[PDB]
From a paper:
Interrogation of several N- and C-terminal boundaries in this expression system yielded a soluble and crystallisable polypeptide for hGBE1 from aa 38–700 (hGBE1trunc). Inspection of the asymmetric unit content as well as symmetry-related protomers did not reveal any stable oligomer arrangements, consistent with GBE1 being a monomer in size-exclusion chromatography (data not shown), similar to most GH13 enzymes. hGBE1 is an elongated molecule (longest dimension >85 Å) composed of four structural regions: the N-terminal helical segment (aa 43–75), a carbohydrate-binding module 48 (CBM48; aa 76–183), a central catalytic core (aa 184–600) and the C-terminal amylase-like barrel domain (aa 601–702). The hGBE1 active site is a prominent surface groove at the (βα)6-barrel that could bind a linear glucan chain via a number of subsites (left), each binding a single glucose unit. A region of GBE-unique sequences (aa 405–443), rich in Gly/Ala residues, has been identified based on alignment with GH13 sequences. This region, replaced in amylolytic enzymes by sequence insertions and bulkier residues, maps onto a hGBE1 surface that is proximal to the ‘+1, +2 …’ subsites, and to the β4-α4 loop that is disordered in hGBE1 but adopts different conformations in the O. sativa and M. tuberculosis structures (right). We posit that this surface region, unique to branching enzymes, facilitates access to the active site by an incoming glucan acceptor chain. Tyr329 is a surface-exposed residue in the catalytic domain and confers stability to the local environment by interacting with the hydrophobic residues Phe327, Val334, Leu338, Met362 and Ala389. Additionally, the tyrosyl hydroxyl group hydrogen bonds with the His289 backbone oxygen (left). Mutation of Tyr329 to the smaller amino acid serine (Ser329mutant) likely removes these interactions (right) and creates a solvent accessible cavity within this hydrophobic core, both of which could lead to destabilized protein.
Numbering used by the authors: 43 to 365, 384 to 467, 471 to 700
Write the structure that this text describes.
């Protein structure tokens, strides 16, 4: 692991981009010439990279699917270009909405039909097996009417999927998300959206990880304009939008995928077994290839310019790095990060990497990967372990604090989207199990099982929110303890959509108890917006008492007190503080609005006296019931 070496390889390639292309700006604008483009003179210009093709042709509805009437002209470095002259009667060559295909002829004499790697729009019609390549040339392009919101001080991320964002068992639309989902997200106090499964993927049940058309916005949810309007509308509400970028692998589809484009097992990918991911059954990019760099870097630029995303989460980074480190893959990621931050410094990149490779989320100029954040993937593991293997009496407070404070900036979250899937368990299900379906009605007994579940759900989220990282993430539904599970239509359930949805209406039902968890989430994030503890320095933990099961710490001037003891409550409990004066409760999980027992009097003045305790110069006395979390603010006398 040589940091000087990683930077030298990066600096060298970036320098070549400047001398052989026109810099990284021009280099990443390949989408302007590659693919299919109607020119201002009425003609059509086309260009593809296909080094192993014998011939390249364009065909479709516009020429009666004549396969060879439009041959590309062969260029240097495996490229092909085509210009079709304007029609004599000055009508359009390729009408909006019509079908196209690139024809590839092999040295074997085989005739292959392909969708362009640079396609904007692909549609599956009715019950067909394969996707069609639809030429996108609308009457009116969408014009963005709102500017980027100011860079947020801290990220409070709402991880989302457009298709499952309604209560119906169908693929929900971009417009539905825009009209009905966006204002819910804003009201919860989230200032950032992590948009999954946007890059086009033929297999809906892959949850967006199986890419077929890399420049195509998934047609499932609607048209490209409807996606642009979604992002634009989000900006008007003061919310930035991040895209999940999958550049780690590609679907093996060849008819409507990137695989075997030029009839070869090594075009955008590596030749042989090295270019295949056995566990995922997918193809692997040749990041060392100059044209693969152009392709992927132009893709990043594409999502920034055309759809105005505010940044990216690069999925599957761990896979990219380890076939020994893949120095070609890391050099791309550095170039990708360099690209994003050079065009806009306020843009954000997040790395999904479980390996924890050093310096990945530190600056490139220090030999780093250049990522702004990494996911704190150790945190959900900890909550699963505790809930699976340990009775409440046996929870190690010191272990909880170590996991949450162990840190490069990370995005903290309590549970993952993987945990919302079928066969797995959510936090809500770990805590309430079968009583999830019997006692979530306010007309039923408030059993000790439901009570314990509701309280720990709030506490687990809050301590993760306040202690765990420099950013927070929440997967759609979990903010109110969404019941049941998530599943996509597939073979294993006979193409069922019954669990491919989200029951947002559960929070609106006054007769159900999901509103309690939802209310807590909204006030938690609104509190962070006021005090900004996520951007504050790392907390000072004054107490992790194993016997009393109390965790106490200070961050951003606020005082956090957690009582994880399953039965004991404390009436004159001493907690150390940094500041003298009067303290007031600013958040209490025992409030009636959160599904608590309303035991605390919020009008109570807490006074800090000069009395050393737990390494703090001052201390106060508090009443903290079993399974209750408290946040206190120092006010003025």
């Amino acid at each position: 692991v040589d940091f000087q070496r990683r930077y030298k390889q990066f600096s060298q390639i970036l320098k070549n981009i400047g001398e052989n292309e026109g810099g990284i700006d021009k280099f990443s604008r390949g989408y302007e010439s590659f693919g299919v483009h109607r020119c201002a003179d009425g003609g059509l210009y086309c260009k593809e990279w296909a080094p192993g093709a014998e011939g390249v042709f364009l065909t479709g509805d516009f020429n009666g699917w004549n396969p060879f009437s439009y041959p590309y002209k062969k260029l240097d470095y495996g490229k092909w270009e085509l210009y079709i002259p304007p029609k004599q009667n000055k009508s359009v060559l390729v009408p909006h909405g019509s079908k196209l295909k690139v024809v590839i002829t092999s040295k074997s004499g085989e005739i292959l039909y392909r969708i362009s790697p640079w396609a904007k729009y692909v549609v599956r019609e009715g019950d067909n097996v394969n996707y069609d390549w639809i030429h996108w040339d609308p009457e009116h392009s969408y014009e963005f009417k709102h500017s980027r919101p100011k860079k947020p001080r801290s990220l409070r991320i709402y991880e989302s999927h457009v298709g499952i964002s309604s209560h119906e068992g169908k693929v929900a639309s971009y417009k539905h998300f825009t009209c009905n989902v966006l204002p819910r997200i804003k009201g919860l106090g989230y200032n950032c959206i992590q948009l999954m499964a946007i890059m086009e993927h033929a297999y809906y049940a892959s949850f967006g990880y199986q890419i077929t058309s890399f420049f195509a916005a998934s047609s499932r949810y609607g048209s490209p304009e409807e996606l642009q309007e979604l992002v634009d509308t989000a900006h008007s509400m003061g919310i930035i939008v991040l895209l999940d970028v999958v550049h780690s692998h590609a679907s093996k589809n060849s008819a409507d995928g990137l695989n075997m484009f030029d009839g070869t097992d090594s075009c955008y990918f590596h030749s042989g077994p090295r270019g295949t991911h056995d566990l995922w059954d997918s193809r692997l990019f040749a990041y060392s290839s100059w044209e693969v760099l152009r392709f992927l870097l132009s893709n990043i630029r594409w999502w920034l310019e055309e759809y105005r995303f505010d940044g990216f989460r690069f999925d599957g980074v761990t896979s990219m790095l380890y076939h020994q480190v893949d120095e070609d893959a890391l050099t791309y990621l550095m170039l990708a990060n360099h690209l994003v931050h050079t065009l806009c410094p306020d843009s954000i990149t997040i790395a999904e990497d479980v390996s924890g490779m050093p310096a990945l989320c530190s600056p490139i100029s220090q030999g780093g990967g250049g990522f702004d954040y990494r996911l704190a993937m150790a945190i959900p593991d900890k909550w699963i372990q505790l809930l699976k293997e340990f009775k409440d009496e046996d929870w190690n407070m010191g272990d909880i604090v170590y996991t949450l404070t162990n840190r490069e900036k990370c995005i903290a979250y309590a549970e993952s989207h993987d945990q919302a899937l079928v066969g797995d368990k959510s936090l809500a299900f770990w805590l309430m199990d079968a009583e999830m379906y019997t006692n979530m009605s306010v007309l039923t007994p408030f059993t000790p099982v439901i009570d314990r579940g509701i309280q720990l759900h709030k506490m687990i989220r809050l301590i993760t929110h306040g202690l765990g990282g420099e950013g927070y993430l929440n997967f759609m539904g979990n903010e109110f303890g969404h019941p049941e599970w998530l599943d996509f239509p597939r073979k294993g359930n006979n193409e069922s959509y019954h669990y491919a949805r989200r029951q947002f209406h559960l929070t609106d039902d006054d007769l159900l108890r999901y509103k309690f968890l939802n209310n807590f989430d909204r006030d938690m994030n609104r509190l962070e917006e006021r005090y900004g503890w996520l951007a504050a320095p790392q907390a000072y933990v004054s107490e992790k008492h194993e016997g009393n099961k109390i965790i106490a710490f200070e961050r951003a001037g606020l005082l956090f007190i957690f009582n994880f003891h399953p039965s004991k409550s404390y009436t004159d409990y001493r907690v150390g503080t940094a500041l003298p004066g009067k303290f007031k409760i600013v958040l209490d999980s025992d409030a009636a609005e959160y599904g608590g027992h309303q035991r605390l009097d919020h009008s109570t003045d807490f006074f800090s006296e000069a009395f050393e305790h737990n390494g703090r110069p001052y201390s106060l006395l508090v009443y903290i019931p079993s399974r209750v979390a408290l946040i206190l603010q120092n006010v003025d006398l």
